[PDB]
Structure formats: structure tokens, C-alpha cells
């Protein structure tokens with residue numbers, strides 16, 4: 582049925598890394614675009630497994646995979662907007678309304694993942710992609726894992742993530758709950774979106790920037806650029822004790838989270 586519809590052309594490189602490269606693939610017939618993650622197999626098995634059980638508007642869709650010898654081909658959703666990382670201006674951030682909208686969407690995606698027992702473990706601007714309408718989608722489940730199965734939660738112990746975004750308990754406790762960790766990384770992402778900089782190299786007492794935060798020195802560079810409303814949310818998210826840290830349902834009740842700020846997407850306009 583309909584010849585050539587199976588053929589995809591690798592038009593360009595969307596990004597590379599330490600395992601594979603991601604390229605934009607365009608269908609020969611329909612011209613539909615998708616992102617193909619090429620992993621030179623010479624982790625990936627679990628990534629595919631996790632991706633197959635993902636279906637949400639704020640999570641990069643997985644279409645399928647092609648073994649073909651050793652080179653593994655993962656067909657994923659193409660997000661023309663690129664990485665949220667590139668939408669963050671160094672030392673500045675982005676307009677608060679935009680950050681709020683992206684944060685809302687990030688929360689939606691994380692609620693979904695946690696809802697099906699999956700923790701991402703490496704949430705950062707480089708892994709949050711944007712589609713044509715700037716809708717945020719969580720990507721790269723290479724470090725993800727199931728933390729809840731048969732309604733039984735499994736505590737984590739593996740060191741995973743990226744230091745500036747990792748929660749403090751991952752560095753000082755043998756075991757820890759999965760959810761507060763993703764929540765913390767989302768808080769670091771929010772900070773980056775509102776200030777254009779990361780607060781610390783890592784959440785450890787030996788890190789001066791981290792000690793200052795614990796001491797409420799918000800008059801210092803990072804926090805001084807953030808308005809009081811979102812800063813109060815950050816004070817609830819970036820809490821060292823994961824058991825006292827705000828949970829997502831409570832984040833959804835936060836004053837800034839619910840503050841009207843962002844208008845629609847300027848759809849219509851014809852005065853007179």
C-alpha cells in the first residue's frame with residue numbers, strides 16, 4: 582500500500598553526544614518530520630522499554646525502533662523549537678510569563694511520568710524540547726527508571742543526573758525517594774529560566790553558593806534577579822530535606838504558579 586512511504590531521508594544533525602547523534606528525518610512521500618536517535622551499539626534496551634509506555638503531550642513521543650545489525654535507530658518526535666536551553670539568555674533568563682508557561686508544562690509532563698511510576702532523573706534545559714507552538718516536551722529517557730511497580734515504591738540508590746541539577750540527598754544519602762529528586766531538578770530549571778544562571782556547581786555544603794542559599798542570602802546574584810512570588814516558590818522547592826520539600830500537587834497550589842501572567846498566542850486581531 583503506497584510505495585516508498587517507508588523511506589526516510591536524514592536531512593540534518595539536530596545534536597550529538599556521548600552515545601549517538603540525533604538527526605532530522607523527513608519522509609520521502611509525506612514529508613513528515615521525525616527525529617532519529619542513532620546509537621552505535623558497539624541502557625538502550627531499557628530506554629526503548631520506557632519510551633514505549635509513554636504517551637503525553639508534554640513528553641517526546643516514541644514511534645518505534647529499528648535494530649538492523651548493531652546501529653540502533655530510535656524514531657522519536659521532532660520538536661522544531663529545539664532545546665529550552667537555547668531559550669535561556671545567559672545571566673538574564675527569559676520573560677517571567679514564558680517561564681511560568683514552560684514550568685506549567687514541565688509540571689504536567691512530570692506529573693504524568695510520576696503517575697505511571699517513571700522518574701526521568703536528568704531533567705535540565707538540554708532535555709526539554711519545544712515544538713512549533715513552543716509546547717515543552719520532556720526527552721531523553723536514557724537515565725530514566727521505574728520507581729513504582731504494582732503500586733509499590735522502590736527507593737533509588739544509583740547516582741544519576743547532572744550535578745548542578747541533582748538534589749542534595751543524592752549526594753549525601755544511600756537511598757532516596759525518586760519524586761523529590763525530579764522536583765528539585767525542576768526547581769533548578771525554573772531558576773535558570775528566571776535568572777539565566779545556575780545557582781551552584783552542586784548542592785553540597787562545601788559549595789559556597791549553596792551554603793548562602795541555605796542561609797537565606799537572596800540578595801546575592803542568582804536570587805536577587807528573581808521576583809518575590811516565584812522566589813517564594815523556589816524557597817519551597819529547593820529545600821534540602823526531601824521529606825519537607827514541596828510536592829507537585831502543592832506546587833500546583835502555589836501563589837506564583839497560579840498567578841495570571843501570560844496571554845494567549847495572539848491568534849486573532851483586526852480592529853474596526
Ligand SMILES: O=c1[nH]c2ccc(-c3cn[nH]c3)cc2cc1-c1cc2cc(CN3CCCCC3)ccc2[nH]1
Nearest residue numbers: 594595603616618657658659660661662663720721
Ligand atoms: O526534535 C528533536 N527531537 C529529539 C527527540 C529525542 C532526543 C533524544 C536525545 N537522547 N535521547 C533522545 C533529541 C531530540 C532533539 C531534537 C531537536 C534538537 C534541535 C536543535 C535545533 C537547533 N538547530 C539544529 C540544526 C542545526 C542548527 C541548530 C532545532 C530543532 C531541534 N530539535
